[PDB]
């Protein structure tokens, strides 16, 4: 019973970072070697574990978190760190045992003239506890004056839309990041 690592990596459409998917891969043979053969990688990094020695190890839970991030903001997915994405959308823990996989997707994820589907949480009152998620679309409040439903002035819609076009530079090009947290699941 091979693990569904094939399904996680070749999703036709991923989700925005603010609402990131999660898959509890449990009770299957991992076979991590399938990643290199099929998908070329941009930033293949692991913390607390080794790439080659990943197959000959046993874990009870190997999670999988997937989202799409700007190229220059991939580096915010790491232990600690501060930024728009790490602090307010998806915060990794300090003592992190897992692997982070990032590979370019400008060929497919970029749209013809606009990819306003993907959003990130620009405004939040405070940082996120490690491995958390917020999908609230309530209007943010700025200033002691009470905030009504209409955004208008001093109240903002938190989520802000990426702009993806094929002519954009490598910094602003779309990327796909899958984080496999570690915690039966013993590869061959």
């Amino acid at each position: 019973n091979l693990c569904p690592f094939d399904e996680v990596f070749n999703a036709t459409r991923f989700a925005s970072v603010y609402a990131w998917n999660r898959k509890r891969i449990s009770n299957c043979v991992a076979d991590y070697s399938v990643l290199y053969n099929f998908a070329p990688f941009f930033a293949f990094k692991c913390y607390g574990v080794s790439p080659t020695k990943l197959n000959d190890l046993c874990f009870t839970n190997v999670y999988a978190d997937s989202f799409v991030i700007r190229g220059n903001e991939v580096s915010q997915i790491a232990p600690g760190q501060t930024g728009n994405i790490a602090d307010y959308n998806y915060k990794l823990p300090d003592d992190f045992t897992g692997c982070v996989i990032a590979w370019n997707s400008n060929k497919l994820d970029s749209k013809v003239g606009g990819n306003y589907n993907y959003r990130y949480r620009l405004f939040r009152k405070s940082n996120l506890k490690p491995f958390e998620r917020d999908i609230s679309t309530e209007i943010y409040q700025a200033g002691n004056k009470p905030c009504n439903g209409v955004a208008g002035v001093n109240c903002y819609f938190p989520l802000q839309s990426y702009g993806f076009r094929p002519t954009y530079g490598v910094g602003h090009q779309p990327y796909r990041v899958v984080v496999l947290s570690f915690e039966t699941v013993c590869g061959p």
Partner: antibody
Amino acid sequence: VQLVESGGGLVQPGGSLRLSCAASGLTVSSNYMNWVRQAPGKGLEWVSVFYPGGSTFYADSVRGRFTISRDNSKNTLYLQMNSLRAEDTAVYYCARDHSGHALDIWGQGTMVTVS
Amino acid sequence: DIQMTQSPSFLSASVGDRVTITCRASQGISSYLAWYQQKPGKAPKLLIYAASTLQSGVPSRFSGSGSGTEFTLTISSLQPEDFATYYCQHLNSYPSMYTFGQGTKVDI
């Protein structure tokens, strides 16, 4: 909303100053607030930034000598500097960020010259 | 890293005609760019933000539209009070963040 700024004057090289950003209408502990520098007869430059969370990013030219602070008691923003002859010879501005790129509410500048 | 530069620099424009300003961004750019106006000896105020969004209190006289690397702003009316200076910006990654680039000057 108004952002009146105080502090300034002349400080000798190697001295220290602090500037306070008084804001009446917006919460300093809820908005992206930042410091903008403008030498006389030249373009603008960016100094600091201070997120709603406990985060702060500095420019390369103002790192290690410039410290920013926020006090919700007075609803004001403070910048602490340990001046240098060419690091601080400019008017300083206080601003808020609406859409993650645009600074709208710019306060009146404060002259901070070193001699 | 990207560098923001403006081609016109100094300009001479009369009351009757219009003025067109352009600032370029190296290595491509997103759709987020803001235009500022700074009369001499005054704190600058936001004029146009994002992609030709226009702002409350900014006259419909001003309109700045562009996409990708080539960005520009144009003024349609006769410019009664001759404007002075204008700037671009774009927020960036950790080290640089706000990049304003060289200024622009327009007058009679």
